[PDB]
């Protein structure tokens, strides 16, 4: 029936219905066809389909995290030794209810996380996430004053994409390069960052220059933010500053070339430590440091 093909069908779609929540919805559809009653026939084939999904992954982490939560919920269903049919019906229904929960959480956060942006504050935003931009839009809906500074992120020219999406709202902006980002931290009140993953330790899994932002802000004593939806938690512990799951290059040094083809290669995903984050915002209340780990301990029961 395929799961990778179902995820590939979301091209012109996206937004509101997030990338992990679309992968979880694809997991439920694959589950509900071939009988969820048998725990031997099904769970092994679910594990093989997740393994096939990881093998097809080029540069994504959150899909592996979203599978875990699904699994957990499935196992927790028949924890009460209930009817092997009513528990199954509740499991299949919690697929559309999972995607509906992405709406309710966004409704919660955009009313909680507007409080952090005070009267007339200049913001420097880096790493686009659906939660952080939803804060930015629903604060403009609240009729509050805020200035915005665009960071020139270089994965697939994300800065320009961010700049255009800010233009469609009615908030004054200008381009700032990630090289010169050090020269901005004095006229900026607060620095906001949207995450691709949050660590077991309390650190962050993010894009092509976020650790660099974290350190500079720690030097300038100016606050550093993480805002996300509560599903991007893996049991991952990057021990060092440059160690991450990759399908591509971990810093390659190429031979002598004249035609100029082999060059670009640099760490596209970078880690930052727990100390650099001043504040974290999710739908699971207002909490930052060890909170993430408590969540993970609460899930894994280990």
């Amino acid at each position: 029936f395929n799961i990778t093909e179902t995820y590939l069908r979301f091209l012109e779609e996206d937004t509101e219905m997030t990338m992990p929540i679309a992968a979880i919805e694809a997991l439920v559809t694959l589950l509900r066809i071939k009988t969820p009653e048998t725990a031997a026939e099904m769970i092994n084939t679910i594990k093989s389909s997740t393994e096939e999904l990881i093998k097809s992954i080029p540069n994504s982490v959150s899909l592996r995290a979203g599978c875990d939560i699904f699994m957990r919920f499935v196992l927790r269903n028949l924890h009460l030794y209930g009817d092997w049919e009513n528990c199954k019906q509740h499991l299949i229904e919690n697929g559309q209810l999972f995607v509906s929960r992405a709406k309710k959480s966004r409704n919660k956060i955009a009313e909680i996380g507007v409080d952090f942006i005070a009267d007339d504050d200049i913001i420097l935003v880096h790493g686009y996430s659906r939660a952080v931009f939803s804060l930015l839009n629903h604060a403009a809906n609240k009729f509050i004053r805020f200035r915005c500074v665009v960071t020139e992120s270089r994965p697939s020219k994300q800065g320009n994409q961010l700049y255009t999406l800010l233009e469609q709202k009615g908030i004054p902006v200008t381009l700032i390069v990630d090289s010169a980002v050090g020269a901005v931290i004095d006229k900026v009140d607060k620095v906001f960052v949207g995450a691709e993953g949050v660590a077991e330790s309390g650190g962050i899994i993010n894009l092509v220059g976020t650790y660099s932002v974290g350190v500079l802000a720690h030097n300038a004593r100016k606050p550093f933010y993480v805002v996300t939806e509560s599903h991007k938690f893996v049991r991952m512990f990057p021990l060092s500053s440059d160690d991450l799951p990759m399908a591509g290059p971990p810093l390659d040094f190429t031979r002598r070339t004249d035609d100029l083809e082999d060059a670009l290669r640099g760490p596209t995903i970078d880690y930052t430590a727990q100390e650099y984050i001043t504040a974290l915002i999710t739908d699971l209340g207002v909490l930052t440091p060890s909170a993430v780990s408590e969540e993970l301990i609460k899930m894994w029961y280990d």
Partner: protein
């Protein structure tokens, strides 16, 4: 819900409202005691018979109480504390009326799995236990705190206003095996009188007293062993609102000199609220106490603030009646006493 129903039966609501607004009531410890006696009067007098209608009414009363006074966090916390004590016993009661409920530990994840009696008596005793907890905090502090400070070590102290901290310091000085020098920042616009009484009580017990002007803090930081905070209210992220003047700079001075920072507090003093902005939470003072004459005060726009905030980046320990905790853990202590719903009243 308004106070139209509770007027002849309950009068003490409005006298507490009057005590807050004009600041007749003073010190978080006292504000807590009054709200306890308010909730004592609310249960003893009212007639409800229904439980969910009762709890939501209490929520609205607490919502109005915090809107009446924003700096009364001890007011807000005490209500929230009883609210959670109520909610657990109701959830225990609903399990018996319907008829594994014990997975492993007491976690969170309220987004995963779905769901006449002596309940009022439990509510009564729940208030009584809160009083006794607020009555005795010092006993729970001294067993953790008087283990960390050494002989020939110099202690610098902002906020001499706290009754909690001074009594912690006197129990340590009672130990003849422990010797320490005390530096006290004055905190000019507000703390002055309290700082002078602080210096008097230290001399009364014969402890090496040193009165420091708020300018001289830097001129001593090389010699300072430890820093102690007399906080009013502690928060989720770790940070504190303290009892007025000259703390933030001292903490900044300590961190640059890498001098350790201590904090003495209670769990009722601890708040489940989050300080997203200091701009809203901090209360400002009266500039009358700075500069005389009003015709120059047209041009002399003077700035003075009472409450001072410290970010969590500085302090390391919050010694309570329970124990010593790190700012990166204090949120759990909070959630052990207050529920997630019991925040936005």
């Amino acid at each position: 819900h308004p106070n139209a129903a509770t007027s002849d039966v309950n009068v003490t609501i409005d006298t507490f409202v009057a005590k807050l607004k004009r600041r007749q009531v003073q010190g978080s410890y006292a504000i807590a005691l009054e709200t306890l006696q308010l909730l004592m009067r609310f249960i003893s007098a009212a007639r409800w018979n229904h439980v969910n209608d009762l709890i939501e009414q209490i929520r609205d009363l607490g919502n109005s109480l915090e809107k009446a006074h924003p700096t009364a966090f001890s007011c807000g916390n005490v209500i929230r504390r009883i609210l959670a004590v109520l909610r657990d016993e109701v959830e225990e009661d609903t399990m018996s009326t319907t008829v594994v409920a014990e997975p492993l530990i007491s976690s969170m994840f309220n987004l995963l799995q779905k769901p006449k009696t002596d309940y009022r008596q439990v509510a009564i005793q729940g208030i009584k236990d809160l009083i006794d907890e607020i009555k005795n905090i010092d006993e729970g502090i001294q067993q953790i705190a008087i283990d960390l400070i050494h002989d020939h070590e110099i202690l610098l102290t902002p906020t001499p206003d706290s009754k909690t901290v001074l009594k912690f310091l006197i129990t340590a000085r009672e130990r003849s095996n422990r010797t320490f020098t005390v530096l006290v920042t004055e905190g000019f616009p507000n703390n002055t009188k309290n700082a002078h009484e602080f210096a008097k009580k230290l001399a009364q017990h014969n402890i090496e007293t040193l009165v420091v002007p708020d300018s001289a803090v830097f001129a001593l930081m090389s010699r300072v062993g430890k820093v102690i905070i007399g906080t009013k209210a502690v928060f989720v992220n770790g940070g504190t609102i303290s009892s007025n003047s000259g703390v933030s700079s001292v903490c900044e001075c300590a961190r640059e000199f890498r001098t350790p920072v201590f904090a003495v507090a209670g769990l009722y003093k601890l708040s489940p609220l989050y300080p997203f902005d200091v701009e809203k939470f901090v209360e400002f003072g009266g500039s009358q106490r700075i500069l005389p004459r009003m015709d120059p005060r047209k041009r002399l726009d003077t700035v003075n603030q009472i409450t001072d905030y410290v970010p969590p980046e500085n302090i390391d320990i919050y010694i309570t009646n329970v124990g010593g905790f790190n700012p990166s853990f204090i949120y759990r202590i909070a959630w052990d006493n207050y529920k997630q719903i019991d925040v936005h009243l």
